[PDB]
Amino acid sequence: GSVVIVGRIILSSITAYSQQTRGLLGCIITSLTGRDKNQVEGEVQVVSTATQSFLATCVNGVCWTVYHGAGSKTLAGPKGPITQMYTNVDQDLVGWQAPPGARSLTPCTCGSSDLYLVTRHADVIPVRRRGDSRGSLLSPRPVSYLKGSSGGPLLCPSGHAVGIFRAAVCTRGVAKAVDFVPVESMETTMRSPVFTDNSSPPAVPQSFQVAHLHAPTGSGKSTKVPAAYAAQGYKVLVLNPSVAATLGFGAYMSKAHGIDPNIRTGVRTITTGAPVTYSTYGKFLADGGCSGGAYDIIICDECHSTDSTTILGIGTVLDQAETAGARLVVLATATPPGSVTVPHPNIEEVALSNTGEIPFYGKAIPIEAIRGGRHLIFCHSKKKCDELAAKLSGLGINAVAYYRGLDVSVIPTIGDVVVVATDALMTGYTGDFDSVIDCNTCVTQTVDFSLDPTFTIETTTVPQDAVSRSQRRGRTGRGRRGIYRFVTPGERPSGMFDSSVLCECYDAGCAWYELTPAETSVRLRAYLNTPGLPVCQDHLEFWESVFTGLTHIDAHFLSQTKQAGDNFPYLVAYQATVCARAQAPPPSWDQMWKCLIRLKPTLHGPTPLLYRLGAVQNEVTLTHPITKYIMACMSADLEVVT
């Protein structure tokens, strides 16, 4: 789908009023076609994706809005859809050349502090400038009031543009201030190149440089280029988020380039004294980070990964490399933020239909598409993998499930196989397949600042992003012809991750890498402060405060939660600890709370509840000093998207 203009806010002492122009079927036809033949008027537009609705502002003949709304989407145009002229994921800003009929705001000249926010309902809201990019609501309002209004203008009293609205600063759900993209950031963006080239790798400079490398997987970005660099006399470190891939790099290098490198994974370590090391992000973290004077180049490969260990690993590299003697860091990926899935020459893309013996996600797979040869099926959940795998095994198809917890060796290396796998496959297993069949969904975790008493980590099934889609399909076409079959054509925007992932970082810092909340903050801030990386609301102070007060965990409970491989081993073990000491039962008797099963006869009364990680079946008490500490943490200013 394209973005669709569904109406407009008209502007006059500033006043505003709205006009609707499209309906539901009008929005959805024009989204599918990309052809909007309807005449654009005014300087603020009301815009829609079939998911969401927001605002767009014309300044300098560019119609502008928020990346967190528009993503990399086309805008529906008279002569078909409009490619975005500008994309700045770092600034949460996108832009299309203004349609005919559209007027523009002129940027703000004279330095006014008294500002006016235009909302999607056409209310004009007094705002006092505080920073380059912050203004504070003269009268605070529910955060709900401001939702639907991002991309909207902040005007000075002259009616010129100060910038566009992107986020609300919040105290226990009440919006106190506004975050905005300043009109000066649009001019920098308009000045920046149409296309920058990062296909070719940098040259090792005189002083420290952070560089970016955008190139296909298996171009040589993690094989040819390290060897190339080492040929020049350099010591290089290669970081990857997969054990399987890290391991495999060792045997390929010693064949391809005569370098028998050092391999560092949790499971296995090889020290050869070569000038190339391959390490995982976790093993790099578990190691202490940057070994003083050990490396000239660090290559952070697969830097599009938004799992806690990658973000924490990369952040560590950016905080340490320059002091630890490095000259070059880089950041390597085939799918940077703001990328979209484009045709690949070696891959046939075929949508599924309702014709098929095997039901798949409301569509069907014909048994003839998978009967012989090697095929891979992405399911979103462990439960689906087992169901599907069972079906096909009954049909006589050589089928196997793979997910977190299972050993890789369930997947046969050599025969006919259907591998029914979650994304866990893409860290356990290196191989390529004849076809890939994709459900186009994954399971993600969202933080909810629910004040019932504190926060919640929800687990939801969501549409895949453009990174997922491409990484998944990239399991076929590897220098040979592959098919890709899919349930839905869609993709949500690449390059953003949830605040829960920051929580995951502090947790893993504490559980695995013996990192203080303060030291985690140092590392994440580097990741956050570096452009070209995935983006996230800055809730570093908030999570640091939360984990900072989580003291004297039971180490035995810690061991057990770590051993089990739960998400948030630290958050779970700390609840367990609190329950033990309070002599009170756990939130429920789910497998999460296995470690307390030995105390089940003595624990009674209400749960000293800290935060919600799943279902809560017992009564709760808000009296624990710790619950009280976290409740107080909730009063922090949190930037939430509108």
Place this chain on the structure above:
Amino acid sequence: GSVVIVGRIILSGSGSITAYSQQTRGLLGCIITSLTGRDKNQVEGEVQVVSTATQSFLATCVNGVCWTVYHGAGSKTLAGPKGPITQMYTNVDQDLVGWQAPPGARSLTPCTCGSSDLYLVTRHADVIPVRRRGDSRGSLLSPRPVSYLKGSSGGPLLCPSGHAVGIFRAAVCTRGVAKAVDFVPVESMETTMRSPVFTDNSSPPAVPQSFQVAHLHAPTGSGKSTKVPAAYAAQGYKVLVLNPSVAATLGFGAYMSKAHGIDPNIRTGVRTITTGAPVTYSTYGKFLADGGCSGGAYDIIICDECHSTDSTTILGIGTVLDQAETAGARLVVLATATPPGSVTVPHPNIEEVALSNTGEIPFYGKAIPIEAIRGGRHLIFCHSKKKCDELAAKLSGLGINAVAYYRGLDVSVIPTIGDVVVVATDALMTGYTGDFDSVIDCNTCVTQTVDFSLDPTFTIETTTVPQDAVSRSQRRGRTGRGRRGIYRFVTPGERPSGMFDSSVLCECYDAGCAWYELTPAETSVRLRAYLNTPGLPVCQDHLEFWESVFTGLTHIDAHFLSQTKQAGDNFPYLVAYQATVCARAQAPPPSWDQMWKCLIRLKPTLHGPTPLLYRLGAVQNEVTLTHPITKYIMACMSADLEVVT
């Protein structure tokens, strides 16, 4: 639009019950078929995935009828192969609608074994084991989050044999965890199929020998509250007529003497008259104030505008139903033009006109042309006091004679005689009785919803919503009164009529305590009477829960209570109780919004966190959750609350 079949669940033919889904229409195809009402795809399967332009859910074919929930499907047609299928059955009480299924539609049949091991088929084709615990209940074998059961209402509960026990309609929660399921049993569907499709309630009933409840579904202006009291009284009966509005109450009384030659008794706050006539016009408010039914006084009780879902009307009809047989009445008539399930049909007098973007006057994403309103008498429906003020100011500027009217203003502001454009909230239709040359409708209103949010207790959220079939009809019918009229609108759409929020029940306990000296227990009896009487607006039964809350709200400050009552805003009792706790703690209120004005004079003396009991709006101050009363309401939240899926 119509309900559209977008897919199906396929249930295993053999052995263990297992299901898979097929998707048969994508989103655009769904939207077109909603508008055409034409769907020439063959209906395969017994269980169908259905969608409206808002929600999605399930529909099961049983015995030739395709059944789903009223709360999902309202009174909508079903997109069929010869265009849209009207509903054969609409049961708002059972929460059950039925369309005749397309020919050769695969249908289920009821179960003949009478087994207690049951299986719920969910919208993503999970077969969940349920244990039968009643006629309409079953318990989950392992409890699950209630979010998991969402969009699965209208789906089957199956015996191990694969035949239909019932259709799923709601989950029973403890604090967001679903512990049990409420369904409509398969015999309640055969009751229905054996019974007449068509009923008549257009005529006032004959007075029965012994006590009976009867419905009068007749237009306003067939004299349901003038002509029919008079004819009952001419037959020699004593009649009491109850109405939500004091303007209407006084207005019918003054007409009754003018026309039908009885000076009736009148009972309202503002004016009370005893003549000794066998006809009494009273408001529901004044009736409750009087202590409800006084024995031997009336043979007939007309509960008029019985569609009204304000706390006083529900309390009123609850009282009449609980008391009237015992007070020796022979007949209760629940009279309305717009009963539950009803739909807006054309009117002969009213030309309907869809507002465009061509006009000088912006209105709700559209435009009013001054030509339309420049002379004569016009009424403009607006969801808020803000918009009324805003538009009357624009129209005053455009030089149109424009008065704003809403709750807190004197009906005297509107001229009876002259050229006028009154810009009103729905406060109009209870405060003012007159009609108009045209009516303009924004097609939205403001409503209250409860959310059991556990932050610490509950939220009453105030929201802006699409209007329902009841609103549209009452608003529209303020024009075309026995002459021509023009109804101008923003939206063709209307939501389903005859359902109200659990927040209204809260309002009934609140009015009980604040106005009518009812113990919570006294209110639960009155409300039960309403709830178990069919043919009235329906609501999730949260009586035990609301009762439990209010029962612990003892020793309110009487002063604050009188200040919140006078001020006329919603929940005077929950507001005056929150302020009581605050003042006695020397704590400031949740905000310094108009709500908390009764604490303003004490602002300097008020310090520290608010001892927060519940959320009635924005909370700006720091809170404490230590108050004995917060703890009591927290403890109430553990009650089995039924919620729709």
